[PDB]
Ligand binder design. Sequence first.
Ligand SMILES: [Zn+2]
Ligand SMILES: [Zn+2]
Lengths: 101, 59, 238, 209, 124, 117, 202
Amino acid sequence: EDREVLRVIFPTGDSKVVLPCNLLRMIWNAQKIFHINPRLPSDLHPIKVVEGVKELSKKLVIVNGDDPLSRQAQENATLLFNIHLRSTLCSRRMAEEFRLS
Amino acid sequence: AIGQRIVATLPYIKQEVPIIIVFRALGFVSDRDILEHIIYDFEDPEMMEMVKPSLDEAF
Amino acid sequence: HTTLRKVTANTAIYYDPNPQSTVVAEDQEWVNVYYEMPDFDVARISPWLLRVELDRKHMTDRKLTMEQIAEKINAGFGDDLNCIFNDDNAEKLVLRIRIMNMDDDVFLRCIESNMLTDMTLQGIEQISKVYMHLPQTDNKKKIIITEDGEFKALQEWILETDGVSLMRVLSEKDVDPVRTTSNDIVEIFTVLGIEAVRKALERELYHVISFDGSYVNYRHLALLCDTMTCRGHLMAIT
Amino acid sequence: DDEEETYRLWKIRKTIMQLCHDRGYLVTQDELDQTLEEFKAQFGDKPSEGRPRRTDLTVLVAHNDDPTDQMFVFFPEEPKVGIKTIKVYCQRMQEENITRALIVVQQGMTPSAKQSLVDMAPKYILEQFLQQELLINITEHELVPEHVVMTKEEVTELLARYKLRENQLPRIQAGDPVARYFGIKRGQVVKIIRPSETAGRYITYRLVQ
Amino acid sequence: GRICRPLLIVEKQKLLLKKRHIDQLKEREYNNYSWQDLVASGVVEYIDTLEEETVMLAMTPDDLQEKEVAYCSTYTHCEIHPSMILGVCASIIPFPDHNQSPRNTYQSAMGKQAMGVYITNFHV
Amino acid sequence: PGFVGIRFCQECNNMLYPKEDKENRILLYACRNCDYQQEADNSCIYVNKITHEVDELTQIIADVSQDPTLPRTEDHPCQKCGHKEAVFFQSHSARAEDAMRLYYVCTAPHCGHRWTE
Amino acid sequence: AKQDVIEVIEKAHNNELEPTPGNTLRQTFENQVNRILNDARDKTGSSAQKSLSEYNNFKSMVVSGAKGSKINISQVIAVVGQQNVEGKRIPFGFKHRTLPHFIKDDYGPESRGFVENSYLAGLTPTEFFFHAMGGREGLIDTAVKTAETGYIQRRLIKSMESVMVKYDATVRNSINQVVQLRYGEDGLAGESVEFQNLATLK
Ligand SMILES: [Zn+2]
Ligand SMILES: [Zn+2]
């Protein structure tokens, strides 16, 4: 669904975007800080990845409020970043690409 | 109006003046004399038709 | 836009008292081929004739024919201005006008000078020139999504005009009314509205900034463009 | 001369049906996407002689929320519409007990006719449209974002959430092309949803003036 | 008010400035043979901007040589030296034809702020 | 077709304007200053060459062959006199788009033939 | 390149040149000549660039990006190139001539301002004058753009000066009208954001 939303946002196939946090650089930082071995199997549960990304998305608040209007504005404010986050911190990428613990 | 009119902005005069009027004011009333002074080659109808509006405007 | 002057080779006024025996010798064939049957009120004919010569090059460059031209003249001036013409076969594309009933000859000269300027044979006013080309850059190509899910840049013809009638060009057959745009933000505001001109103005400012390879954060352009459009009209920075 | 005339009539009708559907009027899918050949079958392909006459093109739709809230679409024959024609249409609307109408003129409308359209607003909300601006649906343009007329409850919720007055929202003119497409008057707020390259989606709200 | 400059007149394809003129110019301080005698000899001519339009110049007498493909072969004048296109402050730049022209302009402006001895009688 | 020149009265030397005689159904050229009239001989009153198909060879004059600043060529001899040298130049005239065309003039004195390749 | 330009000139002189769509014959000839000479400049610049050693100090400063560009090296070593005034070759300021040293109607490269020398080789007098013309264009641009750009800057500032991010995170002007419900549509400052790639788009 996020893919289709991006496809209607960027009708030309330009994936270059300007976003707050350089997630690939942070993943690299985590790999080097904790001495992640890319060749060994990881101890990260993909369900932990899904749950952690969802809680993170809940904690990134640009528009504050439980009312439905604030909920929709919050959805819109962090839409592109949350898509980037879900596609970068995906369970599969975190399992066979980044191999974080 | 119909074609391209030639005018002359003389000094100390705040309104355009047709060239034919200026030529007549200098003593050249006949259109032949004025075009003798303006057009030196009577075999050239282009110059002639381009001066004709000024004559038509001052008759 | 194509006026009669753009396709005309040369105009002339003659004094033809009887169309049966014309002044010119090469126009005696089709004039009699037209006059042997009474198509119009021959009695309401004026001896002042207005013969215009076209040129095959400009006629072909616009896919234009004497039929369309004569129809346009007889529409702009009704039946008051009779026009006749030959087929598109003679070596010279010629068509002859007369006035139906200031003196007559002056009136013919005046309508000649007017028709050669305002008589729109084909095209849309205010659009001087149009260039068709293939965009090599993907910003003007047609970016679609293939059935496999990949972005594919279709190399298609696009037109660039030298004037703007966005209002008219959009409402033309085989013209895309969705991607056709303009760089005149005032017309975008008049035709599409305040949010359309907001987006277009953002695009044009971005084009001006980035043409030299530079880059400015989008929030600055967005803030400038919101300042110029937050009050429902185009607020100039002046 | 004639095939293009019926093409223009079909295109105008298509834009009108899309417009009525976007305003919330009951429009069947069949007429919403009516092919040109189907239009010729239903109305004809010789408007010049009188098949179809523009008086046969008249539309009458009903709002989805209220069947009694109907709306007309008239297609006057004269290029320059005069005050007498406006009086005739208002008389018809009075007879049929309809309170909203669109007049799709060809060339224009006289100053007296426009003043008549303006003065009697509280009785009959009847709008004026050029056939030239109905040959395209501007809401399908790439530059035009998604406009949505908010309800008074939604507007109250908005002003209560952001704690602001109506004069503090950005504005949209009452004569805006999209405002006229959606037929919105002063005091109404329109929610514009547009894609944003920094946020993904952005909703702004413009007050009509 | 007509700005003009001196130029060497050219015969069929030859300068009128023969070696005898250079000889008399070398002993300028003895025989009082001066520039005015060069102009009076019909060897030099002042040409204004408007008469340059009708003149065919040779940049150097090398242009008057007969070439494998003749460019003009009908010259009328010759430059005394092309470096005379420069003014007072640009005539101090060495090798100005090896600089970017803005640099030559900036020097022509900066030779005027340079220190030196602005005049010999500065003590008074 | 060709252009039409202005013609003047024989009495007042003012230009003759066109007029039509219904009685004979014939073109006349009459002066609006005096009361002179003349029987026209062309029957054409106005001519506009929108294409501007002007033969620029008529605008050239042989004296241009004396210009030291024009280029000369030995490759195009003169067809009228056989002189080898000839000056050439472009149109340099407004209203002429295809003005890269070269016009040649013979440098022989008193020949002054002009042509185009 | 000069022989190529001579060939194009000969074609134009013989009416063997037909215009391309969207341009007049003069403009098409100018396009062909300018393309030939730009190709010559680029080829010569590439030759000079490949000739450079690893010890070359021009190449050192260009490679590091400290100062200079490959075009500067080309102009110092290979060829300075075409001088343009208002985006066109040197105009015929005399009567059908750029200088009194040329014949009339000479559209060749040297006549119209092609500097076939390098800065080390040194410019000829006509190349020197044409280069001075081209450089004067840059000086005029630098000295004339400043007033208009500064007036634009002042106008922009006075138009947006009081727009500010408020404590409810909306962007508002002095009148308290809402310009943006969130700054940049995302409520983020421009210093912390940075370029990234959406991995699921392409
Ligand atoms: Zn007379
Ligand atoms: Zn000869």
